[PDB]
Paper text:
The mutation changes an invariant threonine in the nucleotide-binding motif, GQTGSGKT, to a serine. The NcdT436S mutant has a single amino acid change in the conserved nucleotide-binding P loop that causes the motor to release ADP and hydrolyze ATP faster than wild type, but move more slowly along microtubules in gliding assays, uncoupling ATP hydrolysis from force generation. NcdT436S was crystallized and the structure was solved to 2.8 Å. Remarkably, the model showed a large rotation of the α-helical coiled-coil stalk together with one of the two heads, resulting in asymmetry of the heads, resembling a previously reported crystal structure of NcdN600K. The chain B head shows disrupted interactions with neck residues that are observed in chain A and is positioned to interact with the microtubule, resembling NcdN600K head H2, whereas the chain A head interacts extensively with residues of the neck and has rotated with the stalk, like NcdN600K head H1. The nucleotide-binding cleft is slightly more open in the NcdT436S structure because of the substitution of threonine by the smaller serine. There is a difference in the position of at least one water molecule in the NcdT436S cleft that may explain the more rapid release of ADP by the mutant than wild type. The water molecule forms hydrogen bonds to the S436 hydroxyl group, ADP β-phosphate and G583 amide group, and is present in the head of chain A which rotates with the stalk, but is not visible in the head of chain B. Although density corresponding to the bound ADP and Mg+2 is visible in both NcdT436S heads, the density for the PO4-2 and Mg+2 groups is stronger in the head of chain A than chain B. The NcdT436S structure shows the C-terminal residues of chain B, which contains the head positioned to interact with the microtubule, docked onto the motor core, but the head undocked from the neck. The NcdT436S structure shows that the Ncd C-terminal residues are in the same position as the neck linker of plus-end kinesins, resembling the C-terminal 'neck mimic' of kinesin-14 KCBP.
Author numbering:
A (entry chain B): 292 to 466, 473 to 494, 517 to 539, 549 to 566, 570 to 587, 600 to 674
B (entry chain A): 292 to 385, 392 to 538, 551 to 590, 598 to 671
Write the structure that this text describes.
Amino acid sequence: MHAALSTEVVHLRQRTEELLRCNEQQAAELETCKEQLFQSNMERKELHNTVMDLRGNIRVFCRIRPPLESEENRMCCTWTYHDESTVELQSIDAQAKSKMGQQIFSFDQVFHPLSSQSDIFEMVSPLIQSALDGYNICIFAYGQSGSGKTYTMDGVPESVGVIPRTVDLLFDSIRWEYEIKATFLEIYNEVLYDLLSITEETVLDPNHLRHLMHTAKMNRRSSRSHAVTKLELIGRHAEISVGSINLVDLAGSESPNRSLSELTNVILALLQKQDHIPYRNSKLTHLLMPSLGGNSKTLMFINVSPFQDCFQESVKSLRFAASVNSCKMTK
Amino acid sequence: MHAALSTEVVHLRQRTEELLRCNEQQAAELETCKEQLFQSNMERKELHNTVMDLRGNIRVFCRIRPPLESEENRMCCTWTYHDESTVELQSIDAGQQIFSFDQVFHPLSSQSDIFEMVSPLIQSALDGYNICIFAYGQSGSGKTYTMDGVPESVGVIPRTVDLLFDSIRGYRNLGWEYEIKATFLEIYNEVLYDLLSNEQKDMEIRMAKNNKNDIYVSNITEETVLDPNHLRHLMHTAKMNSRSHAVTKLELIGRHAEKQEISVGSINLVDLAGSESPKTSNINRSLSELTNVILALLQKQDHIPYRNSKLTHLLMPSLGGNSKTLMFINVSPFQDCFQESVKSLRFAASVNSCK
Ligand SMILES: Nc1ncnc2c1ncn2[C@@H]1O[C@H](COP(=O)(O)OP(=O)(O)O)[C@@H](O)[C@H]1O
Ligand SMILES: Nc1ncnc2c1ncn2[C@@H]1O[C@H](COP(=O)(O)OP(=O)(O)O)[C@@H](O)[C@H]1O
Ligand SMILES: [Mg+2]
Ligand SMILES: [Mg+2]
């Protein structure tokens, strides 16, 4: 019995130890693997930005939101992702899939419904920073109501969002003298509201802005209005670099008041009709003019719903998103 | 005590079991992380190649060298750098001379400046692309100092290698193992010469083994670099060995055991012979043949006569397709080199002339 037991003890001891060093071996590799994956991710993004710049074409991002717990029984259409920038959608009924069929679109980046509010911002960040270095950055969220425009731009108190993570980046990148001119307005019928037509107030502290913004979001079928938000920056250091971080939140061009229809006519003009562009044919287009044409980095979000009942609309959205990413921004 | 050993056996089993599961869980993590790293690297390579395409798959640069300390008063012609792409020159003792490049390096541009144009292509070579770094110009323009450089200021090749080993080291953290095939040769009068041997012989350019498109130089010395010391040794052995072309080829062969993937690319650092006009008591063919192959590639042609010159045949698998080429046109900042400097630069005109 002694011998036998002895044999076990020895065996298990070697196994325990040989198995222990193996655990360390992996941990070392796991640790290293993360670092490398992290370095790889960082590279792709730097390169993804270099690429989008040299291209010139206004950046277009697709964001596909996940279904809310409420609509737990709401049918979804088939979604295929060919890679980081190409997304396809197919209807539940095959009688439409054969007749024209091939609903595949390719943008600068497609966000899966699992994407977080950070995975989004991390792609917008570069623009926000370039604002300080003297650049006019614009960014809106086209899409049908219920798609995610407001959730992307503003977001929810629980999580966050573009606009407000933007401030945490607008000040952090300052830590040279920087003066900021916050601005809020809205367009229901075709008139401007809030503190404007007239002006704004200056930013003082991150809290003051994080508040000034919350102040505006108050006083808000229901949302067929564009939510713009200007943010002029001032570079002194002591000739004065100036850049604005425009933030627009479109209404929704879903199957129907119709200002968005004039925005598309702009996009089309950004290619053909090089002669007179319908910039001055919409109160929205006018404020977004220094973005669609003039030297300015424009980033648009294309919010879409994964629901079948939204198919026709998703396609209209995706389809319009394609032409926009075709405009070669002068810059 | 049997009981004592008996109790240790149970606890050792509990420990082993609890250990087995910990390791198993780490395996699942590791595999996933490895799977994501490879894909992530695959997209990074794609993104990198896009940037190179955008900057141009065939770029031409100008590099004017500073006046030599061996002549304070030998004349310089009237230079005038219009932008960082255009440059002009003018004679003093006998239209307009204005040429555009992807970038113009003046006499103050350092070797690092030059390498900043190449550095990105080393990554391209490790990602399976074939690069061609060319140094065109008349004797004295600065071709050698550019490509090889000097010990006080190493040139393209030495920097390329240094970057190469560092990047190769890093890649091991992704599961990649890299090997470098080095070959050094000289082309004088359409005749190749091995710079790694003393034995006079014959080396013909035959088709590769795994591809009727790749090249193969029979009787060539193909060293498999063991480490930077080995390579260092070779490069020195080779320099020790005018009117010919010098070609230092680095073949980057990466292997990924786990994914069973390979990545084969190559850097072709060429030191073209002088482009001047000969006298009495030719190479200017393998040279014109080279510029034409680059011009032919630009105009996107079909029937390219690579096999025309010994050089264009050798670099054939690196002059077309995904391949990237940098043409550093060296120039002498002197009046007596006006005609030639204009000739050298004039090539840039033909390059961008391709609408
Ligand atoms: N990406 C997302 N992840 C989680 N929830 C989202 C996401 N996008 C939108 N939502 C939620 O979906 C609903 C519609 O979003 P919302 O921004 O109001 O659509 P829109 O503003 O385009 O009409 C809201 O209930 C919102 O809080
Ligand atoms: N950028 C430079 N800086 C300092 N010296 C240079 C530079 N370019 C060329 N030279 C020098 O000019 C001379 C010309 O030789 P080289 O560069 O090999 O010319 P080539 O290859 O065109 O025949 C060499 O002595 C070299 O060291
Ligand atoms: Mg809304
Ligand atoms: Mg030389």
